[PDB]
Ligand binder design. Structure first.
Ligand code: CL
Ligand code: CL
Ligand code: MG
Lengths: 351, 353
């Protein structure tokens, strides 16, 4: 009973199963057509699905990568050409910190209340070459509102700072479906966005990271991209195109209802336990934090494993101060509902 | 007419096409079985296909990556933790130089005749922390023979040097199907091998790099791998397993005959042309170098493009001394024979003008 990894493992819907049954036809098409044409259609379907109508649609502006973490490796190594220190939201997906640190960047944490609630200070912005925001955030689900994105992009433009966004969880939360590219382009800051198809649908990790950047980004992202790959399989792009079209034709609303159902299953099973609470009441993401008293998430993780249930302690997401995550675990919701419910009834007994 | 990029674009064989038409079944299997089991089957089929029986088969010793270039990024960044300089075969696949340089490594070229024909000097081995060999080499097709691999591994063991091999072209040349892992493990050097499925078959870039390394590698490769990915799609692993089993069932013999046929097309179309020669007569790789005395590979490449044929000049592969490649172009052979023949016919016309 795995409730750890964020990638989707629930059953395909009937519409998605139809796409899988057409793989031999998508192969035929991918053999026959120029990859750039399938790529453009995949990008258009995915960006427009999620409200990002102002994305730059000229060939070459959106660089398709094998994954979002490959995009992040490209960006991190590019940043290291001209940047020493990066401001990074805390907590967040820890691979981002690992890839930045591994490419030689010093990291400055920005807590979520500072990031959403107020302008970044001049002292902070004057000490970093890049501000990095995951939105919706993993693990918290917190969405950077349009008014704050606009102010943050304006601040980065004044300070000469790169604004970088990781939007892997975008598909799960309609509040993240306002047009981010329209905001970024009107502010005129140096900007980069890493989109990701990989967390949305159960595609057996067939996915792309989509690296998008301003024309004045002033980092060697295109050169380093080209040292790592020429592009992704046209079959994967064709799959992204078809899953996005199924999503636009009702699949995405069904996904949101599914995640909401599983989130409610978790909260229903655990809410009666004294001292158990849900740190992110309004999250719509596919992962769910649970807080408890009297024990650590590491101890809960150890006990769950004895019962063959695999969840995640939260320490690792607090990449700057791990003890901040000591009294929480994270539960993956992109799972079939029956195994998920059995897992949380085990967690209920533990807590 | 593209005869530039080395990736395979020929039609599927009947055995491969059967696999493609069963892709929904591989999907169903991937939903039902643990990825680790499918992965182990995929590794077993690919390594044993190409004679690498001594590969480390314990789960987690072979790291599956999205591509061989992702494997190389992981290796390059891993090296930079403790290595400043790398000895690299020259010429070679010049992306390797770009990935190493981009991660802060300084490069020392080793010409092929020196690498294959004699021991490396002690002065080189005290000046580099890694020796990097592409075998079979791209673009030359030259294969590191077993006796020289053993001496290289022994020299690297004596000096605490990492021996790194990029074996993307292995499947094409039976001379590279002696067991490299047996040699490396007996020599006891620090070693890393990057296997690659992506050049063999027309799989629309559905592929894996396989990053394999010794237990004493002494580089943070496992950490950096895991910072970049958890693993590769079970569907791609199942595809690799199935293509490897088809290749074991006659498909690999058919592939060698197909490449030999296309190489023969190129050579018979150009051998009568004044000033043409083929520097790598014994190459069995899917790319082919062609030399000329009368003109520059760049000028030939430019004239080909006016006629809608896209090949590659060789300067780029001579990443340390580009003028060494000034009189050669490279031709991709993993192509349907008919377009390839059209391509080399334009080239013949250009060279005859
Ligand atoms: Cl995750
Ligand atoms: Cl190539
Ligand atoms: Mg080059």
């Amino acid at each position: 009973l795995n409730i750890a990894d964020g990638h989707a493992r629930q059953a395909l819907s009937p519409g998605q199963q139809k796409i899988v049954n057409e793989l031999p036809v998508l192969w035929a098409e991918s053999e026959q057509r120029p990859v750039q044409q399938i790529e453009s259609e995949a990008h258009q379907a995915y960006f427009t699905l999620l409200g990002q109508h102002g994305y730059p649609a000229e060939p070459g502006r959106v660089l398709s990568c094998y994954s979002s973490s490959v995009s992040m490796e490209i960006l991190a190594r590019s940043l290291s050409a001209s940047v020493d220190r990066v401001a990074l939201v805390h907590p967040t997906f820890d691979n981002i910190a690992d890839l930045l640190r591994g490419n030689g960047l010093d990291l400055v944490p920005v807590e979520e209340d500072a990031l959403h609630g107020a302008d970044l200070s001049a002292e902070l912005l004057s000490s970093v070459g890049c501000v990095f925001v995951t939105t919706p955030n993993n693990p918290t689900g917190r969405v950077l509102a349009e008014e704050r994105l606009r102010r943050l992009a304006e601040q980065c433009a004044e300070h000469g700072t790169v604004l970088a966004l990781d939007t892997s969880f975008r598909g799960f939360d309609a509040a993240a479906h306002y047009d981010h590219y329209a905001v970024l382009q009107e502010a005129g800051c140096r900007w980069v966005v890493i989109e990701d198809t990989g967390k949305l649908w159960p595609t057996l990790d067939l996915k792309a990271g989509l690296l998008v950047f301003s024309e004045d980004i002033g980092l060697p992202v295109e050169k380093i991209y080209s040292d790592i790959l020429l592009g992704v399989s046209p079959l994967i792009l064709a799959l992204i195109r078809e899953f996005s079209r199924d999503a636009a034709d009702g699949g995405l609303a069904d996904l949101h209802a599914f995640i909401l159902h599983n989130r409610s299953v978790v909260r229903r099973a655990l809410a009666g336990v004294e001292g158990v609470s849900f740190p992110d009441p309004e999250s719509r993401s596919s992962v769910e934090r649970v807080a408890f008293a009297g024990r650590t998430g590491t101890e809960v993780w150890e006990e769950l494993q004895r019962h063959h249930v695999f969840a995640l302690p939260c320490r690792q997401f607090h990449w700057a101060e791990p003890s901040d995550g000591d009294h929480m675990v994270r539960i993956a919701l992109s799972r079939s509902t029956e195994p998920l419910e059995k897992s949380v009834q085990v967690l209920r007994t533990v807590l």
